[PDB]
Amino acid sequence: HDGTSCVIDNHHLKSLGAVLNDVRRKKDRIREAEYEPIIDIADQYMVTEDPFRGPGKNVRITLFKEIRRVHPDTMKLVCNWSGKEFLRETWTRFISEEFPITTDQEIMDLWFELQLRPMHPNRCYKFTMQYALGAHPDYVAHDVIRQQDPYYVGPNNIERINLSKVYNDNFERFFDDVLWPYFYRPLVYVGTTSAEIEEIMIEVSLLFKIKEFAPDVPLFTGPAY
Amino acid sequence: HDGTSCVIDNHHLKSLGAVLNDVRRKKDRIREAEYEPIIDIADQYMVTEDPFRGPGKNVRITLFKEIRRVHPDTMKLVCNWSGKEFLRETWTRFISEEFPITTDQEIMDLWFELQLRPMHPNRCYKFTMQYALGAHPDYVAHDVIRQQDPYYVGPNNIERINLSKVYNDNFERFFDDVLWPYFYRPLVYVGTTSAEIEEIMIEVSLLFKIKEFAPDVPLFTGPAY
Amino acid sequence: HDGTSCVIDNHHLKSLGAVLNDVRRKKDRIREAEYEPIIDIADQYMVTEDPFRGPGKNVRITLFKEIRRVHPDTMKLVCNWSGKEFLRETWTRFISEEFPITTDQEIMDLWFELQLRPMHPNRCYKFTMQYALGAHPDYVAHDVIRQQDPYYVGPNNIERINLSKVYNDNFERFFDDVLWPYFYRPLVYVGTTSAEIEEIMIEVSLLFKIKEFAPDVPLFTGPAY
Amino acid sequence: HDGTSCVIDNHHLKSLGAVLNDVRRKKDRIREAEYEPIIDIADQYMVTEDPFRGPGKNVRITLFKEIRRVHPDTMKLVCNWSGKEFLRETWTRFISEEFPITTDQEIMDLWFELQLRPMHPNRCYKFTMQYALGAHPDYVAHDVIRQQDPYYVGPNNIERINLSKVYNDNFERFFDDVLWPYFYRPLVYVGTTSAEIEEIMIEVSLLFKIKEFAPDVPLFTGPAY
Amino acid sequence: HDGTSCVIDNHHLKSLGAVLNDVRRKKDRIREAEYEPIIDIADQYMVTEDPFRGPGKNVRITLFKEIRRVHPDTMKLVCNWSGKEFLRETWTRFISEEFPITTDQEIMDLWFELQLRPMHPNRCYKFTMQYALGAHPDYVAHDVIRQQDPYYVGPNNIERINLSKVYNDNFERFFDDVLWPYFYRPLVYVGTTSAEIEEIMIEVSLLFKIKEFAPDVPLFTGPAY
Amino acid sequence: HDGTSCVIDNHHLKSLGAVLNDVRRKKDRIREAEYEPIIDIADQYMVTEDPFRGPGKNVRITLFKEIRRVHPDTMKLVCNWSGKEFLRETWTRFISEEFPITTDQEIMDLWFELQLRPMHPNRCYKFTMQYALGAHPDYVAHDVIRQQDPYYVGPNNIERINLSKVYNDNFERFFDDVLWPYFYRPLVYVGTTSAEIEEIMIEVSLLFKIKEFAPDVPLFTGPAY
Amino acid sequence: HDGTSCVIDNHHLKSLGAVLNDVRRKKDRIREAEYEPIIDIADQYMVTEDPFRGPGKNVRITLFKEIRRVHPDTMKLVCNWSGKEFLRETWTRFISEEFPITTDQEIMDLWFELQLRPMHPNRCYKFTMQYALGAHPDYVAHDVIRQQDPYYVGPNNIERINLSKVYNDNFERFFDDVLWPYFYRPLVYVGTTSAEIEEIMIEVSLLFKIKEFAPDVPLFTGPAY
Amino acid sequence: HDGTSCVIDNHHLKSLGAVLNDVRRKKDRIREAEYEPIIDIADQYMVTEDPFRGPGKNVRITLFKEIRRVHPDTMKLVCNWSGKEFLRETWTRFISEEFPITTDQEIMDLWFELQLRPMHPNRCYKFTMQYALGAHPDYVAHDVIRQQDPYYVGPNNIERINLSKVYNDNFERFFDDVLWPYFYRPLVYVGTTSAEIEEIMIEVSLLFKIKEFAPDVPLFTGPAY
Amino acid sequence: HDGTSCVIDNHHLKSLGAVLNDVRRKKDRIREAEYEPIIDIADQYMVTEDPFRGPGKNVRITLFKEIRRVHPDTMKLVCNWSGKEFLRETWTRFISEEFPITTDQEIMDLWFELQLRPMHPNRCYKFTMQYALGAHPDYVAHDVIRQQDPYYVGPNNIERINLSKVYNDNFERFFDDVLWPYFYRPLVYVGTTSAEIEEIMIEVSLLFKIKEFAPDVPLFTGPAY
């Protein structure tokens, strides 16, 4: 909206910068049209919207923190819960944080979130991760493993693993309705790309993606009207 | 409107070319913003909209054609009418061409138009012009003059000189209402930039710029309704 | 003024960035000189300084606002004053706003200003304008006309039409000294480029360009000295 | 780590190339920061890490080779096993190749891999593929079909189809524990984009993506310690 | 640290902008490597770190100000002290400003600093300087000299001349320990590049570059511990 | 020397690439000439050739190594020799390494060289240095000091401090001929830019720059001729 | 040869512009080497040196001038000599102009040269040419022909046709030694690309390319020595 | 010829785009002049106009087609005519196609044209050629030879070999006037760059380049006038 | 100062090229500001002004010329004066050339200048230099030495070595006041980078840098006033 127009003796004057901008935009538009066929080649393919910046809200149910020291070329176990203990923490923490649930809503996805921090300054390394999502209830995960083709955690040191992909409620009901409560539990390992031992802070959360169906209606103090 | 969106297991996919275009446009927009201050410097000044491509309609009342041969460094007289004859041609040709005048309208401007054509192929020169818009009624313009600081006609070989900047009607009324009918008449000369004699076709028109105020109403066959 | 100079054992040290800048400026200056002949070609022509950002001060005598809805391809009349009413508003509003006039000054120009606003969000169209500056006092302008080769209002939705192009004073004196008070009045129409009806806010002002000749002298409380 | 530093009479000298590099990097860093907002627009989206260059190791259990000649616009059947025969080959080849299994591990994914080779030099065409992953056990796949909206195999002539989306063990146990052993079997077709018959070598493998959880402990000759 | 990582069905997703940045950095790194041999050519040479932005702290012992008017092509004397008076000012001002000296320290360098200011706005010229660092004690410097191959003061109008390039102490001790106290004194001249007389403010300081060897120990209120 | 020439029927043929290269070089040469005036602006200034890559040979008389741990914002003393011990090491090590001295030669410069290495991988910091070149023989340098405007060691982690800025010989003669043997000794400190303690390897050498005047004559086994 | 070198306290200073030029040339040389393989591709082919700017000297034996007017799409005959008359002019003019022939020499080539000039200014067209080099002695060339796939004369309006692609001597000897004197004669036509008749000046010369074998010896006035 | 000119109150207005184009052309012209010296370096050499797109008309006397299969690294004989049979085909086909010859004309050149086509789609190879233009009449060319430094046929798969670089007539006259009719005959071989056998269509033509000297006269029905 | 301004009906016109230049300069200024932070990084370092193009005047006291032939990889002695003879030449030549000394002045620096010329055309090599500035008075320099890490003379074949970094007077006074007259003498060697013997012209000068303190006063013919 730069510039302006005026009329002197029937003649229409227009701001020079606006006119030169109109010319430039024409030039750019021709260039854009000339190479528009390449966009259609690129449009044979698609990318995925970031699930956490994307649709649904994020509810971050932080679970715990722990410090581990990790030898080079190894990974340390983050958590060793039974399926029951994982379910107890998942159910209790989510329900305790979210109640009262006042809207219709659906959990789109449940993510296991690792937030990883170096405990020392002036270090240069990146984080690695490996996981399993279940095991024989009598299988106890090794506390430390060797690194073998791990996941490389992205530059922001956050990794999120998808786990998935209002009535009266309690944990016993929830647990009884789970078919294999003792089998499924995230067993997650964290390592680094460092050639020295590193001390790391691990913060574990459950990130729930939720879509609410909130009606376009007022909340009134009772009685209504 | 390239590309599309789809949802698979809650996840939103978008066309790659569209995304890369969004990124590119962001990049261009940053560049545009970075140098936007220069547009404001340019916007301290204005340019004039072309009167003939601009507002008002064009009514081209062609008057006559003539062939002249023009010696180098000279200009030949196009027209030598008295003021009365110029007014007779202006009034008669416009009114005869435009009647019936069925709308409210105003003449914004009257232009004397020279359309100039070379009469030979394989020539390379441009046209020149000089003029006077009035003279003592007893002054007869020279048929040929020497070129001295002329107007250079633009590349499209058209030059337009502004001259300006429904009741029962007739020329005698018009003429009687003009104050100095014998003084004002365009006296126009045409030359070239050629070093040889050139044969030129000269076509002279009066170009009227008109704005109509046509009501947003139907024309009915009488009687209406 | 970056960098600095110092002397060690007669030897003069100078900041490296300043020196590299001196070299770069030399390079730029050579480039500028090499293509300076093109500036002289461009300097065969001139542009007009924006009258409102340019010399003289702006005194905006706002007159009125009105809302009009405009059908596609039509224009609605903004004002239908007689010449007398236009003169009354022009004189009364300017003089009432500007008095006391304490300096010698001259009105350079008088502009009729349209400020145009869409009354709805999420619309995409531009404004158009047509006008007449006078009419037979018995001519009443059509309330709505069809659009025909209009003025296109610039991107900032402001159009200004030039109308032009201390003693005891009163409107009757002013009116008596105007030769054709009932003939000259701006009759202005506003339309859009929209294919739907649009609701528009029209704000009309008179913009006076004024140059003051204020002496370089003190104002004292009387008596002076 | 180019260049160096030295001190002469308290004054610090530094290598010129290193300094000019520091200046250049500053320049690049400013440019990077200026357009960093576009990275955030791109970061609204994500791409998928190549599963075979990505986490987990690759175990390529090659199954068989075959030569087929393929008419233009047709595709030839690669394999026509029953579900039982597919399971026998999958189980037998994997277990025979991998035993002894000395670590805890999980199969992340099972991929059906087509490696495709032209059997003639100086040809120019690309490969196509279609598949089904199961069928009525009494359905026998056509040996040859017409090409209709196929998968286009990428430039490296390898296509991988995901099929998925230590105790004493034997095939009879495995087979008995599969619910619908006779229904699921990859039925894969290969064609080309050629306008002539082409002779093609087809090599079929099962590619297992495996993550091992190898403890960070020694292997000793028994008895340990 | 833009973007992030997540895992869906074993597959690793990474932010698109981060990936495109990894690609771009690879591209830049290849370019940097390709032309790295030129850095080694540049590294055959070195530049000097700015002594005042460089190591050691700056202690600016301002001495005096004076206004001089300087004719074109001439330089005016800034100071005409004897060696004794220069030593008295140097010793007294430094010691009076710096005591108490609570750390081990060494003066790296002593600089004579001219800060030069135009006394009028809307002038365009640069400053010049000439100097001698000693003279026969019976030599009295000319108050004004002609300019001949002077030092050109850098754009920031500061010139610094190197002059060089805790016990009980007093000036008489200092003076007695100087071998030729009456010979060494800065005799400094200031001119301009102007073709008119210019009025200039001259501010003279002694700038001491000092390195302190402050132990990494506490200061306690006595008695300690 | 690409391409070639041949003659066919008196006509001279020349390789096309060579001709296009001649044209390109002409183009480059014009560009070089056009901006050659900027080189002369840059040539108002000079840079210093790297003393160690430059004239004279380098004789690196390594003296000792030591490991120090350095707290953030502090510097640790490298050496605390008396002047006598510094002279003993300088004389003994140089003479023992260089004898037999078989040519006329001159020591251009003596440099104190610090080679600095991090003792841990995956660290990111740079080194700092401060020094004194002499002190009261009864002054014992602090083992650790706080960092204050230090020298920043260049990217290659080498810093060199200039110290400067055949007959029968022995140390007692050398020592007796030194005027102030106990005063001059390099007292050098090393720190880092790290926010944590760092363990550093310090290697100290004396680097002698030597020019030899070796005659252009044979060495013969005696007797000659 | 810009800049210079100097030595201060063993240290070598070099002009900054020269150093930056050394760096730039290194950069250019790397670029040149990187793309040098393309020169070898271009060097698979050769171009011909201009015969007239190339080896041998040019002796221009001008023969005659003539003016012809040429209708569009036609060509006019330049010359209609018999073979005998062509030989007489060739022999007589060359020998009369060149004698005395004082050196050993060889005619490399004989060229028929047309120099073509427009006789009018402000025309825009190019020249065309057709020719025959011999004909039945009883064949008389048409004075005017239609243009059919002619040679287009280059921008400099010169066309040269190769015709080829000391003893006592006379024309009768020369003529008798020619085998078919009456058959070979250049019959040359000139036209234009103009759509109008053009008046053209035609200047015809014989251009002899000659190589002399002049001994590296003095000319003396007789008797020698 | 974009834009236009008009005159308002003596002042000359010109289209902005035309003016900016005049400025741009000035800029381009300066650039062209700056590097014009390189054109003169390139003009030391010349290239040859394509004989078939160049002067003279093309008369393509197609002779025959044949299919050959060619083993890798070999070439197959195209034609094995005696000189007499080659002359019979050349004479008969040209004269039969061209009669009636109604104009004076000259054959500039005779070319042997190979048009080569792959007989299969989806192949990637180029063609090669070798030839001899004559042989002992008792020499019979080998049907197949090995490829050794052949001509590589250009991308358009056409190769043309120059062979060279109105009275009552008959073949017996023509044959009797040829000196060595049985010796000269094109013996041409065609191969490929393929590593497999290829089936090729070979089409052989004689391409005559002809210049006609058609008089600029009418053809009349007899009797004329 | 291109273009101009004019006023028509209160409106200000300005030259188009000047306006476009104002816009361009704004654009350049934004770019300059955007990257100005890099200048400050470069300004952490300084370069040295060329001493000979820099402050002080140059007085070139040429001493002698000599021709030497230099074998590859060797250097030839330029001068072998005793300290006394060097002092005699330095004193005598300077004082004889400079008297009468009519101004107060100071020698800033004394430089030993080698000007080196090839004695043959069509050679391609550079010059080298080595030197000593003093020696035992009984040390006679070798006439020829082998090249070992020499100074490389800059492209302009001039090398300058700093040696440093009105009463009745005579050489005996000067000599008596020098402390070690027989020790200090420049002993300079010159070589080349050639692989063949080269014949070189060596011209040796003493270049004095002098600053004069000429008072801004008239010289009058006596008696003054």
Residues 6+ apart with CB under 8 A from B29: none
How far, in Å, are F75, F91, F203 from residue F79 at the CA level?
Answer: 12, 17, 11
Written as six digits, the tokens of C183 are 């003939």
Edge-to-edge, what's the strand order for the sheet holding C151-152? C144-146, C74-77, C184-192, C127-134, C151-152
How deeply is C102 buried, as exposed, middle or buried, from its count of CB atoms within 10 A (0-12, 13-18, 19+)? exposed
Q: Is G179 on the interface with C (CB under 8 A)?
A: no
Give me the phi and psi of D16, to 5 degrees please.
-65, -40
Q: How far apart are CA B62 and CA B202, in angstroms?
A: 11
Distance CA A175, CA A169 (A): 11
| Span between the terminal Cα atoms of chain D, in Å | 48
Instruction: Evaluate whether chains E and H are touching (3 or more beta carbon pairs less than 8 Å apart).
Output: no
A4 to each of B34, C153, C156, C191, I20, how far by Cα in Å?
21, 8, 6, 17, 19
Concatenating the DSSP letter of every residue in A184-216 gives: EEEEEEEEES-SS-EEEEEEEEEEEEEEEE--S
Handedness of CA D193, D196, D197, D201 (dihedral sign): negative
Cα–Cα distance for residue pair F219/I128, rounded to 1 Å? 25
Structural domain tally of chain F?
1
Q: Which residue's structure tokens are 């102030």? A: F180
- Distance, in Å, from the CA atom of G15 to the CA atom of B125, rounded to the nearest integer, reads 55
* Alpha carbon of E15: minimum distance to chain B alpha carbons (Å): 13
Nearest to C4 by CA among I44, I56, D7, F152: I44
Across the interface, whether the CB atoms of C42 and H30 are under 8 A apart is answered no
Q: Do D17 and E11 touch (CB under 8 A)?
A: no
C34/F30 Cα distance (integer angstroms): 13
Check: CB of residue D208 under 8 Å from CB of residue D106: no
3-class secondary structure, H31: helix
Resolution (A): 1.7
Under 8 Å between Cβ of E206 and E61: yes
Tokens for I91, please give them.
Answer: 């004193």
Q: Does B45 touch chain I (CB under 8 A)?
A: yes
Contact G7 I48 (CB under 8 A): no
Taking the CB of residue B64, how many other CB atoms lie within 10 A of it?
A: 12
Chains B and D touch (3+ CB pairs under 8 A): yes
**Pick from F30, H42, F28, F16: nearest CA to G53:** H42
Q: Dig out the tokens for D119 from the structure.
A: 């059997």
d(CA F33, CA F36): 5
In chain H, the residue whose alpha carbon lies closest to the alpha carbon of F18 is H42
- C134 touching chain I per CB within 8 A: no
Q: Residue length, chain D? A: 225
Under 8 Å between Cβ of C111 and A6: yes
User: The tokens of I46 are what?
Assistant: 């300084």
Longest alpha-carbon distance in chain H = 95
Q: What one-letter code names the amino acid at B107?
A: I
DSSP character for E153? P
**Integer angstrom CA distances of residue C93 from C89, C98, G179:** 6, 8, 110
Q: With left for phi above 0 and alpha for psi between -120 and 50, is residue H3 left, alpha or beta?
A: left
How would you label H184-199 residue by residue, b for 16+ Cβ within 10 Å and e otherwise? Answer: ebbbbbbbbbbeeebe
A127-134 β-sheet, strand order: A144-146, A74-77, A184-192, A127-134, A151-152
Q: Contacts of residue F42 in chain C, CB cutoff 8 Å?
A: 19, 23
Question: To 10 degrees, what angle do helices E16-42 and G16-42 make?
Answer: 110
Greatest CA separation found in chain B?
A: 95
Look at residues C137, C118, C149 and name the one whose alpha carbon lies nearest to residue C80. C137
Strand partners, E197: none
Residue H27 contacts C, CB cutoff 8 Å = yes
Burial classification of residue H73, based on how many CB atoms lie within 10 Å of its CB (0-12 exposed, 13-18 middle, 19 or more buried): middle
CA gap F186, F198 in Å, rounded: 23
Nearest Cβ partner of F27 from H38, H44, H45?
Answer: H38
User: What's the length of chain I?
Assistant: 225
Indicate the DSSP class of residue A63. Answer: E
| Token pair recorded at residue A216 | 């376009």
Q: Do F and I have ≥3 inter-chain CB pairs under 8 A?
A: yes
Name the nearest CA neighbour of A92 among A81, A84, A103: A84
What's the one-letter identity of residue H182? Y
Measuring CA to CA, how many Å separate G178 from each of A148, G173, G206? Answer: 94, 9, 18
**Is F144 within 8 Å of E44 when comparing Cβ atoms?**
no
Outline where H43-82 has alpha helix (H): none
Residue I177 to residue E140: CA distance in whole angstroms: 25
CA distance linking residue C20 with residue G17, whole number of Å: 10
Q: Are strands C5-8 and E158-162 parallel, antiparallel or unpaired?
A: parallel
| Chain F contact probe: residue of H36, H44, H45 with most F CBs at under 10 A | H45
Rama region for G149: left / alpha / beta (φ>0; ψ in -120 to 50; rest): left
Chain E: closest CA distance from residue C13 (Å):
9
User: What are the structure tokens assigned to G208, written together?
Assistant: 């002899």
Cα angle: H113, vertex H114, H120; to 5 degrees: 155
Residue E98: what residue type?
A: E
Q: 3-state DSSP: chain H helix, strand, coil percent, rounded to 5? A: 20, 40, 40
* Residue F25 burial (10 A CB sphere; 0-12, 13-18, 19+): middle
* Residues paired with residue H190 on neighbouring β-strands, in sequence order: H76, H129
Q: G57 at the E interface (CB within 8 A)?
A: no
Evaluate whether H22 touches C38 at the Cβ level (below 8 Å).
Answer: no
| CB-based contact, E167 to chain F, within 8 Å | no
Bond into G100 cis (ω within 30) = yes
- How far is residue C166's CA from residue G157's CA, in Å, rounded to a whole number? 78
Q: Helix F16-42 to helix C16-42 angle, to the nearest 10 degrees?
A: 110
Question: Torsion over CA of H168, H172, H177 and H179, rounded to 10 degrees?
Answer: 160
In Å, what is the CA distance from H179 to each residue of H83, H95, H131, H183? 11, 20, 22, 9
Residues of D in contact with A150 (CB under 8 A): 55
Cβ–Cβ contact A21 with C under 8 A = no
Contact A82, A180 (CB under 8 A): no
**Residues F146/E214, Cβ–Cβ less than 8 Å:** yes
State the Cα–Cα distance between residues A145 and D212, nearest whole angstrom.
Answer: 9
> Measured between alpha carbons, how far is D193 from D196 in angstroms, rounded to an integer?
9
Beta carbons within 8 Å of H152's beta carbon, 6+ residues apart:
H126, H127, H128, H193
> d(Cα H53, Cα G153) in Å, to the nearest integer?
15
Spatial contact of H201 and H117, defined as CB atoms under 8 Å apart: yes
The single-letter code of the amino acid at E166 is: V
Q: In what order do the strands lie in the sheet with H144-146?
A: H144-146, H74-77, H184-192, H127-134, H151-152
3-state SS string for C24-77: HHHHHHHHHHHHHHHHHHHCCCEEEECCCCCCCEEEEEEEEEEEEEECCCEEEE
Range of the domain at I210: 1-225
I200 three-class SS: strand
Tell me the C-alpha distance between D190 and D152, whole Å.
10
CB contacts, 8 Å: A19 with chain H: 16
Q: How many Cβ atoms from other residues are within 10 Å of residue G154's Cβ? A: 12
Paired sense of beta strands C184-192 and C74-77, if any: antiparallel
CB nearest D51 (choices: E11, E48, E49) = E11
- Closest to F155 (Cβ–Cβ): which among D2, D7, D13? D2
Residue A44 DSSP code = T
CA distance G170 to F216: 73
- Three-class secondary structure of residue B37 per DSSP: helix
User: B81: buried, middle or exposed (CB in 10 Å: 19+, 13-18, 0-12)?
Assistant: middle
Contact A219, A115 (CB under 8 A): no
Whole-number Å distance between alpha carbons of F85 and F137? 12
When CB atoms are compared, the residue of B120, B121, B195 closest to G121 is B195
* Neighbour-count burial of E91, counting CB atoms closer than 10 A to its CB (0-12 exposed, 13-18 middle, 19+ buried): middle
CB F205 within 8 A of CB F61: yes
Look at the block and give the residue holding tokens 């204020």. C214
Q: Determine the Cα–Cα distance for residues H135 and H188; give it in Å rounded to an integer.
A: 12
CB I47 within 8 A of CB C13: yes
* Distance between first and last Cα of chain B: 48
Pairs from D28-36 (Cβ < 8 Å, separation ≥ 24): D28/E28, D30/I34, D30/I35, D30/I37, D30/I38, D34/B30, D34/B34, D34/I34, D35/B27, D35/B30, D36/E2
Q: Rounded to an integer, what distance in angstroms lies between the CA atom of residue B116 and that of residue H4? A: 12
End-to-end CA distance of chain E: give it in Å, rounded.
Answer: 48
Closest CA to E207 of E99, E84, E114, E86: E114
CB contact C48 to I (< 8 Å): yes
Report how far residue D47's alpha carbon sits from residue E16's, in angstroms, rounded to the nearest whole number: 6
> DSSP of D185-204, one letter per residue?
EEEEEEEES-SS-EEEEEEE
Tell how far CA G106 is from the center of its chain.
Answer: 17
- How far does the CA of residue E141 sit from the closest CA of chain C (Å)? 19
Q: Which residues from I are below 8 Å from G13, CB to CB?
A: 48
- Dig out the tokens for I190 from the structure: 């010159």
**CA angle, corner C192, sides to C190 and C195, nearest 5?**
145
**Neighbouring C-alpha atoms within 13 Å toward the C-beta of E173:** 5
* CA–CA distance, C175 with C90 (Å, rounded to integer): 11
Angle at B81 between CA B77 and CA B82, to 5 degrees: 135
- How many angstroms separate the CA atoms of A144 and D214, rounded? 9
Q: Could you give the CA distance from residue A196 to residue H11 in angstroms, rounded to a whole number?
A: 82
Reference I45, options C114, A93, C2, G148; nearest CA is C2
Within 10 angstroms of residue A39's Cβ, the number of other Cβ atoms is 18
I7 CB near a chain H CB, below 8 Å? no
Based on DSSP, count helices (H) and strands (E) in chain E, helices before strands: 3, 12
